[PDB]
């Protein structure tokens, strides 16, 4: 149990003893769940129109010959013409959006043709955190609406979630809240000018997205559940191979660093191997994870082991000259 133990690596081995080892087949299913979360987050960020205009303008920036051809495209004269016809598809869906199921089928066809573009992960993070910060803008907006309707009038919350959470684009709900002959609705006149500020702020959101609040709420809700599923699958993949980290770092013990620092940096390398693992090459998990764990442990003991720090390229150079001469 939790007794008088004082070694932290013994408590680490106790807290890692609760999980079980992985079988021959199970990590392919965990990697399939990881790739399902990645496919879910990609297919929910696909149909966002301002992200499509962002990738076209970054393609105009790379075609204006001042940026390199490596920091925005990884793979799949070919990308140029397919982005040109994506731009043709963009300028025809800018005016066939007015007409109504034709708009839905054309934006989903733009979504499925978007899936070929293998974008860079740093700009994937740019797309995800840009969706997150516009969601933070509208969330503190609705938190401000929530705060102003609870602070002054002490009203129940069933009428608010049936009236405010409808369209919330025009003023059809605010006048309905005044016109239901309640003794606080006649004293919601001093709240009126900054909630009109809030309403024109929502209209600012409608012109910078193009779609309403409900569609982008559904888009970021799909974003959130896909991110949570992929992160939980990645977390379950991480806490099943810690014994591999202690098996690798068992040999690097008396190299100038503590034993617990080694398995901690091995856990960092294990996370970096989980995030960039491909299951389609037939290998299970260990032949790909061992290289990253060994790299993280070696780069830990090559830097944080001495006061006078020698870089790794200089120590292999002087080692090569020591072995030849």
């Amino acid at each position: 149990e939790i007794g008088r133990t004082t070694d932290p690596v013994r408590m680490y081995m106790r807290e890692m003893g609760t999980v079980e080892l992985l079988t021959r087949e199970g990590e392919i299913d965990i990697a399939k769940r990881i790739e399902d979360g990645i496919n879910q987050v990609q297919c929910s960020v696909a149909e966002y129109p301002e992200a499509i205009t962002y990738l076209l303008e970054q393609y105009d920036r790379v075609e204006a010959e001042e940026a390199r051809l490596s920091d925005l495209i990884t793979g799949f004269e070919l990308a140029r013409e397919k982005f040109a016809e994506l731009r043709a598809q963009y300028v025809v869906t800018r005016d066939t959006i007015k007409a109504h199921a034709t708009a839905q089928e054309e934006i989903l066809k733009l979504s499925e043709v978007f899936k070929q573009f293998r974008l860079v992960p740093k700009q994937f993070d740019y797309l995800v955190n840009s969706m997150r910060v516009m969601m933070d803008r509208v969330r503190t907006q609705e938190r401000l609406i929530m705060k102003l309707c609870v602070e002054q009038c002490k009203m129940p919350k069933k009428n608010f979630i049936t009236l405010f959470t409808g369209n919330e684009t025009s003023d059809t709900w605010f006048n309905a809240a005044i016109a239901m002959n309640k003794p606080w609705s006649e004293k919601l006149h001093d709240v009126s000018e900054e909630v009109h500020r809030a309403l024109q702020k929502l209209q600012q959101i409608e012109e910078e997205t193009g779609l309403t609040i409900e569609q982008v709420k559904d888009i970021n809700r799909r974003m959130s559940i896909g991110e949570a599923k992929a992160r939980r699958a990645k977390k379950e993949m991480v806490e099943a191979n810690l014994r591999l980290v202690i098996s690798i770092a068992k040999k690097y013990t008396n190299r100038g660093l503590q034993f617990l620092d080694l398995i901690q940096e091995g856990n960092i390398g294990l996370m970096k191997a989980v995030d960039k693992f491909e299951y389609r090459r037939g290998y299970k998990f260990s032949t790909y994870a061992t290289w990253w764990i060994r790299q993280a442990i070696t780069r830990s003991i090559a830097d944080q082991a001495r006061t006078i720090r020698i870089p790794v390229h200089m120590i292999e150079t002087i080692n090569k000259l020591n072995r030849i001469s």
Binding site: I2, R4, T5, T6, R10, M11, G17
Partner: protein
């Protein structure tokens, strides 16, 4: 008197208590306790007078 004080029941409970004395804070099990009590005294490499 030592048997009346002794709170263990049988061999596996005795090995669990010896495990809890020697390596405290670790969750004991049967094979680790058996291997620990064998290799403390009755192993030719971890015990020698000779």
């Amino acid at each position: 008197e030592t048997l009346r004080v002794d709170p263990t029941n049988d061999r596996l409970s005795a090995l669990v208590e010896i495990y809890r004395m020697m390596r405290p804070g670790e969750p004991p099990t049967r094979e680790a306790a058996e291997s620990l009590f064998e290799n403390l005294f009755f192993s030719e490499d971890r015990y020698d007078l000779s």
